[PDB]
Amino acid sequence: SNAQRFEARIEDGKLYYDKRWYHKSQAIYLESKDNQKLSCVISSVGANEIWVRKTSDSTKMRIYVGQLQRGLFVIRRRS
């Protein structure tokens, strides 16, 4: 697949996105046009999906690896 704007995958149980490593406890900012910078902390890293937890809403947000590779979400790391 060449349709990749961001290189992302899950390696050794950690998130490898934007050529940068993310922890399981990782705090990250998800920002978009129709979505402001969400200060969210990852709760668990799966195989094809990452579970990030909204600090405010306390809900679980499941992001798929493929969606990150297409560049659906812009994730900035804070660690």
mmCIF file of C-alpha atoms in Angstrom:
data_model
loop_
_atom_site.group_PDB
_atom_site.id
_atom_site.type_symbol
_atom_site.label_atom_id
_atom_site.label_comp_id
_atom_site.label_asym_id
_atom_site.label_seq_id
_atom_site.Cartn_x
_atom_site.Cartn_y
_atom_site.Cartn_z
ATOM 1 C CA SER A 1 0.000 0.000 0.000
ATOM 2 C CA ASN A 2 1.408 3.372 -1.072
ATOM 3 C CA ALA A 3 -1.562 5.344 0.263
ATOM 4 C CA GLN A 4 0.192 6.147 3.528
ATOM 5 C CA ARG A 5 0.575 9.729 4.695
ATOM 6 C CA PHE A 6 1.824 8.626 8.098
ATOM 7 C CA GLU A 7 3.855 5.523 8.876
ATOM 8 C CA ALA A 8 2.215 3.722 11.789
ATOM 9 C CA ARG A 9 2.088 0.256 13.355
ATOM 10 C CA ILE A 10 2.190 -1.546 16.700
ATOM 11 C CA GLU A 11 5.593 -2.989 17.553
ATOM 12 C CA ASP A 12 6.432 -5.087 20.650
ATOM 13 C CA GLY A 13 3.137 -3.885 22.102
ATOM 14 C CA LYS A 14 3.980 -0.201 21.726
ATOM 15 C CA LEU A 15 2.703 2.341 19.226
ATOM 16 C CA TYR A 16 5.036 3.218 16.371
ATOM 17 C CA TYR A 17 3.529 6.256 14.673
ATOM 18 C CA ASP A 18 5.053 9.152 12.714
ATOM 19 C CA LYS A 19 8.447 7.448 13.095
ATOM 20 C CA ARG A 20 8.079 8.043 16.830
ATOM 21 C CA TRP A 21 7.492 5.691 19.752
ATOM 22 C CA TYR A 22 4.509 5.909 22.075
ATOM 23 C CA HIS A 23 4.197 4.285 25.502
ATOM 24 C CA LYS A 24 1.205 2.365 26.845
ATOM 25 C CA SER A 25 0.839 5.035 29.530
ATOM 26 C CA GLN A 26 1.552 7.624 26.816
ATOM 27 C CA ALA A 27 -0.185 10.978 27.009
ATOM 28 C CA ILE A 28 -1.061 12.235 23.542
ATOM 29 C CA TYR A 29 -2.798 15.141 21.862
ATOM 30 C CA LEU A 30 -5.289 14.319 19.120
ATOM 31 C CA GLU A 31 -6.272 17.380 17.115
ATOM 32 C CA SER A 32 -8.232 17.845 13.897
ATOM 33 C CA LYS A 33 -10.350 20.467 12.132
ATOM 34 C CA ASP A 34 -13.620 19.227 13.619
ATOM 35 C CA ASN A 35 -11.923 18.116 16.831
ATOM 36 C CA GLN A 36 -9.829 20.165 19.256
ATOM 37 C CA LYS A 37 -6.630 18.924 20.903
ATOM 38 C CA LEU A 38 -7.770 16.006 23.037
ATOM 39 C CA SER A 39 -5.452 15.423 25.963
ATOM 40 C CA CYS A 40 -5.788 11.653 26.151
ATOM 41 C CA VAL A 41 -3.800 8.915 27.849
ATOM 42 C CA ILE A 42 -3.438 5.456 26.342
ATOM 43 C CA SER A 43 -4.892 2.679 28.485
ATOM 44 C CA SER A 44 -3.881 -0.361 26.454
ATOM 45 C CA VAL A 45 -2.091 -1.160 23.211
ATOM 46 C CA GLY A 46 -3.560 -4.027 21.217
ATOM 47 C CA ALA A 47 -2.560 -5.642 17.944
ATOM 48 C CA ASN A 48 -4.449 -3.762 15.250
ATOM 49 C CA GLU A 49 -5.891 -1.135 17.541
ATOM 50 C CA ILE A 50 -4.854 1.266 20.276
ATOM 51 C CA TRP A 51 -7.106 2.136 23.205
ATOM 52 C CA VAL A 52 -6.753 5.751 24.253
ATOM 53 C CA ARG A 53 -8.669 7.154 27.198
ATOM 54 C CA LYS A 54 -10.155 10.648 27.177
ATOM 55 C CA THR A 55 -9.167 12.281 30.464
ATOM 56 C CA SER A 56 -12.422 14.248 30.532
ATOM 57 C CA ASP A 57 -15.011 11.884 29.062
ATOM 58 C CA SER A 58 -13.321 8.827 30.600
ATOM 59 C CA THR A 59 -14.511 6.916 27.538
ATOM 60 C CA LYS A 60 -12.360 4.548 25.501
ATOM 61 C CA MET A 61 -11.337 5.541 21.991
ATOM 62 C CA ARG A 62 -10.200 2.700 19.744
ATOM 63 C CA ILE A 63 -7.920 3.795 16.923
ATOM 64 C CA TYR A 64 -6.964 1.311 14.221
ATOM 65 C CA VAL A 65 -3.438 1.121 12.803
ATOM 66 C CA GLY A 66 -4.708 1.387 9.236
ATOM 67 C CA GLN A 67 -6.506 4.629 10.043
ATOM 68 C CA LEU A 68 -3.263 6.123 11.338
ATOM 69 C CA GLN A 69 -1.352 5.019 8.237
ATOM 70 C CA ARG A 70 -3.846 6.838 6.019
ATOM 71 C CA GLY A 71 -3.346 9.848 8.252
ATOM 72 C CA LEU A 72 -6.853 10.106 9.658
ATOM 73 C CA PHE A 73 -5.653 11.370 13.036
ATOM 74 C CA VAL A 74 -2.800 13.714 13.899
ATOM 75 C CA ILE A 75 -1.295 12.438 17.131
ATOM 76 C CA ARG A 76 1.301 14.494 18.991
ATOM 77 C CA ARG A 77 3.291 12.831 21.764
ATOM 78 C CA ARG A 78 3.751 14.258 25.244
ATOM 79 C CA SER A 79 6.275 12.295 27.289
#
